[PDB]
Amino acid sequence: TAAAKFEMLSQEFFNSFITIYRPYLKLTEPILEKHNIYYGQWLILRDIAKHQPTTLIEISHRRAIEKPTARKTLKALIENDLITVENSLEDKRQKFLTLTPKGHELYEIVCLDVQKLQQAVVAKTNISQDQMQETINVMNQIHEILLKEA
Ligand SMILES: O=C(O)c1ccccc1O
Ligand SMILES: O=C(O)c1ccccc1O
Ligand SMILES: O=C(O)c1ccccc1O
Numbered sequence: 001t002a003a004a005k006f007e008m009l010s011q012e013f014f015n016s017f018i019t020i021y022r023p024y025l026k027l028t029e030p031i032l033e034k035h036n037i038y039y040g041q042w043l044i045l046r047d048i049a050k051h052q053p054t055t056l057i058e059i060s061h062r063r064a065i066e067k068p069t070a071r072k073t074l075k076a077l078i079e080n081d082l083i084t085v086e087n088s089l090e091d092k093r094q095k096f097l098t099l100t101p102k103g104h105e106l107y108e109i110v111c112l113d114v115q116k117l118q119q120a121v122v123a124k125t126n127i128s129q130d131q132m133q134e135t136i137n138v139m140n141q142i143h144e145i146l147l148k149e150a
């Protein structure tokens with residue numbers, strides 16, 4: 001439900017990494033479900049974890065989602081006691097956001113499970129550390145272009 005909720009050489013090349021996304025999320029889905037959190041929620045949670053104290057404004061910008069989407073997901077994170085909002089009289093979109101203790105516990109647990117699952121996947125392949133850094137090198141080049149464009 002989580003993965004479901006979330007929804008030429010150059011051609012074979014792009015296909016090789018774009019088609020891995022969905023299978024990847026299906027496999028990591030249970031990690032989030034076990035913590036009663038959905039993928040959209042996890043991404044914003046993680047984002048806050050790494051940038052807190054942060055704001056709906058900054059979040060929307062780094063995540064590249066629309067305010068309505070970010071507002072709705074944050075609202076669920078708050079309602080679930082995973083993040084706390086600075087109490088202020090300013091606009092909600094300007095208020096500082098940080099993880100609650102429950103939020104941190106959930107975060108550390110998901111993060112470690114994901115890390116171990118990734119290690120496992122790799123361990124079943126013939127991929128070398130070198131092959132991994134070379135891939136990283138190529139992907140970041142692609143990523144630079146897609147972002148500078150936007
Ligand atoms: O950046 C993503 O789109 C993403 C999606 C699901 C899980 C981890 C991720 O980084
Ligand atoms: O970083 C990921 O690839 C990831 C995947 C599934 C759930 C949480 C995550 O951070
Ligand atoms: O990637 C995100 O930060 C995200 C968050 C909520 C809903 C959809 C999304 O892609």
Ligand SMILES: O=C(O)c1ccccc1O
Pocket residue numbers: 056071074075078085092093095
């Ligand atoms: O509902 C809130 O308290 C809230 C707080 C910060 C950002 C968006 C929000 O909906």
